Amino acid sequence: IIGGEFTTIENQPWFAAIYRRHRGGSVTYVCGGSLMSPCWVISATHCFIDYPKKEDYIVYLGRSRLNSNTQGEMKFEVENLILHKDYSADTLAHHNDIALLKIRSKEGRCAQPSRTIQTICLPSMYNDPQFGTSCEITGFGKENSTDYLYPEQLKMTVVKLISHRECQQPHYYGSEVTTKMLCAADPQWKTDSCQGDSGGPLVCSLQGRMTLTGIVSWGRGCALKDKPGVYTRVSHFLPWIRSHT
Ligand SMILES: CC(C)[C@@H]1NCCc2ccc(NC(=O)c3ccc4cc(C(=N)N)ccc4c3)cc21
């Protein structure tokens, strides 16, 4: 996150920290995720497309720092890694960038809800918050575009949803942004998600209930003028999630 505020997992019960083991033994952070149901996590396909082995991943819940085992956390493994069957990556835009990771602990059980481990509701058919709505994003991603290390503590920030016609203007993303994607950004371009945040939650309070409306996907740079952050429009993929879970 660029700018924003430092927060602790208690505020983001449904945020999943996804890691990956390397030959030799080191473990680096990869991407974020959202707790769908006790046994499922949803993220982005571009965080696993290159190393499609369910065995190389680790998924943490209730973890507040990168190199610390926060009180009440749970360590998991990927029982099933399902990727959208039509994914492609262009110069900027990423298509069908949605993914399902069916988690499972060494003992064979799924997540166990608590004060620090919760789930968010999926959006419903054709019901997306209007443009200009404020929503939050979370991740252990960069705090600057020139840093190579991630913040040791979880961060969060708020942005505003941008209409589709406004995201297709020449000085924005032209025809690169498609109707199955959403755009969000700070009207002052000082705060925004960035590299390391991909796959993470974009939560909008829709008609009372906190809804998972977007999945961090792509964007030109981080917090750059007229260059919003593009997210995966969950509502569109409901039939996919349902039939695939
Ligand atoms: C190491 C890297 C090149 C990695 N390789 C596997 C394929 C692949 C695909 C996309 C990405 N994505 C990013 O690095 C990446 C970089 C910047 C991003 C910026 C925003 C945003 N400005 N809100 C929103 C999302 C962003 C995602 C990384 C990789």
Please name the amino acid found at residue 7: T
Q: Find the 206 Cα to ligand 1 centroid distance in Å.
A: 27
CB 212 within 8 A of CB 203: yes
Per-domain residue ranges of the chain: 1-12+120-235, 13-119+236-245
Closest CA to 151 of 36, 55, 8: 8
195, burial (CB in 10 Å: exposed 0-12, middle 13-18, buried 19+): middle
Please name the amino acid found at residue 101: L
Please name the amino acid found at residue 47: C
The token duo for 187 is: 């009207």
C-alpha 30/C-alpha 43 separation (Å) is 11
The token duo for 236 is: 């569109």
Closest CA to 30 of 66, 69, 70, 80: 66
Resolution (A): 2.8
- Phi-psi category of residue 25: left, alpha or beta, with phi > 0 → left and psi -120 to 50 → alpha: left
Residue with the smallest CA separation from ligand 1 atom 17 is 195
C-alpha 98/C-alpha 37 separation (Å) is 16
- Asked if the domains at 1-12+120-235 and 13-119+236-245 fall in one CATH topology, the answer is yes
The reply to whether ligand 1 has any atom less than 6 angstroms from the CB of 232 is no
CB 101 within 8 A of CB 57: yes
Confirm or reject CATH 3.90.580.10 for domain 1-12+120-235, answering yes or no.
no
The token duo for 138 is: 């979370």
- Three-state SS for the chain is CECCEECCHHHCCCEEEEEEECCCCCEEEEEEEEEEECCEEEECHHHCCCCCCHHHEEEEECCCECCCCCCCCEEEEEEEEEECCCCEECCCCEECCCEEEEEECCCCCCCCCCCCCCCCECCCCCCCCCCCCEEEEEECCCCCCCCCCCCCECEEEEEEEECHHHHCCCCCCHHHCCCCEEEEECCCCCCECCCCCCCCEEEEEECCEEEEEEEEEEEEEEEECCEEEEEECHHHHHHHHHHCC
Active site residues: 46, 97, 198
Beta bridge partner(s), residue 81: 101
**First and final C-alpha spacing in the chain:** 30
> Which residue among 97, 147, 198 is best mutated to probe the pocket of ligand 1, counting the most ligand atoms within 8 A of its Cβ?
198
The reply to whether ligand 1 has any atom less than 6 angstroms from the CB of 173 is no
Cα–Cα distances in angstroms (integers) from residue 124 to residues 38, 84, 120, 216, in the given order: 19, 20, 13, 19
CB 218 within 8 A of CB 211: no
Closest CA to 218 of 174, 187, 182: 182
The token duo for 21 is: 């083991």
- Experimentally, the structure was elucidated by X-ray
- Phi-psi category of residue 55: left, alpha or beta, with phi > 0 → left and psi -120 to 50 → alpha: alpha
Confirm or reject CATH 3.30.70.260 for domain 13-119+236-245, answering yes or no.
no
Q: Find the 218 Cα to ligand 1 centroid distance in Å.
A: 6
Q: Find the 195 Cα to ligand 1 centroid distance in Å.
A: 5
Cα 122 → chain centroid: 13
